[PDB]
């Protein structure tokens, strides 16, 4: 499923990400744009043999099981495929755990480079929230 920005903002708001762990809704929308381009089915291989899955490009080296990353941990205790569903519940739940690891939203390389310190409210501006 490819979300529109206001549709994703609405979904992320219902799922409780607005100001979750100190990050306003705009941060989560911006992160999803620069990670997956709002595509829940996005998959990207990393050079270490791991893969990034879904709307928030959650990595198989630490968070999910894809059965092809030797040395993987599965900290969100889920198959990586569950992060590819049209419903964002599993990706939101694993993101809530990731943001609580030592790096905050810097765990998302793209959020750090492209979103951090910018006008992130622009990503929810115009949406009837």
């Amino acid at each position, epitope marked *: 499923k490819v979300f529109g920005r206001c549709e994703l903002a609405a979904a992320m708001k219902r799922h409780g990400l607005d*100001n979750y*762990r*100190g*990050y*306003s809704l705009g*941060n989560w929308v911006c992160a999803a744009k620069f990670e997956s381009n709002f595509n829940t089915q996005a998959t990207n291989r990393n050079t270490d043999g791991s893969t990034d899955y879904g709307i928030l490009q959650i990595n198989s080296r630490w968070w999910c099981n894809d059965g092809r990353t030797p040395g993987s941990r599965n900290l969100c205790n889920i198959p990586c495929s569950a992060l590819l569903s049209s419903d964002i519940t599993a990706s939101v739940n694993c993101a809530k755990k990731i943001v609580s690891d*030592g*790096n*905050g939203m*810097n*765990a998302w*390389v793209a959020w*750090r*480079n*492209r979103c*951090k*310190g*910018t006008d992130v409210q622009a990503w929810i501006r115009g949406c009837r929230l």
Partner: antibody
Amino acid sequence: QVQLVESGGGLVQPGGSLRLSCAASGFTVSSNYMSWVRQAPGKGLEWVSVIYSGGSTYYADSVKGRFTISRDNSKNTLYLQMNSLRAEDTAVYYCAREGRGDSIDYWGKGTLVTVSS
Amino acid sequence: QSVLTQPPSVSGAPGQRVSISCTGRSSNIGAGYDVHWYQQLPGKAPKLLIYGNTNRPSGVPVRFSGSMSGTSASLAITGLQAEDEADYYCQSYDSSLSGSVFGGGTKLTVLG
């Protein structure tokens, strides 16, 4: 127009405490990413601490537990409370405003903090 | 200034193309965290020179350019000028340290 003015710097004894202040104008400190960067005389830049727009705080391992970054909305000021100050904490302390990807947009002029007996 | 390393000094001649390397690791540049660059003139606070590996803020001359590849970054000065004599600092983010990191700094000298 955007301004960062540090104060509260000076001489303190080891094990002593000092509170740095950074009065800002041209923006809301509560809506920005603010950091402290220090520089020992004739040495390189060393990142100290940061406060996010949403309030998350992070510290260098060298200042962890001893230093506390904070901000007051009423006064539009960023603070650096330093405890158990040691000789090696002697440096020029810069208040800093972050831009995209923790890049630093604006710096203050710096305030000298000398930790000596 | 240990997880990012720079040469302590770089010396160039007027008009020379010189570069200042920033050597990182898998926990910073290697992870994909962008490199920022600062120029620090004598007795002054540093000023942002390059952001997000390659972007120049307004007022920064076109002779300054940045590049990133693998675990290292590079600050390039094409047509070196006497006014470029300063201390240069690379900066990134390190996931192992959970914060911003600076390189050790490079003293640039213009000889002529």
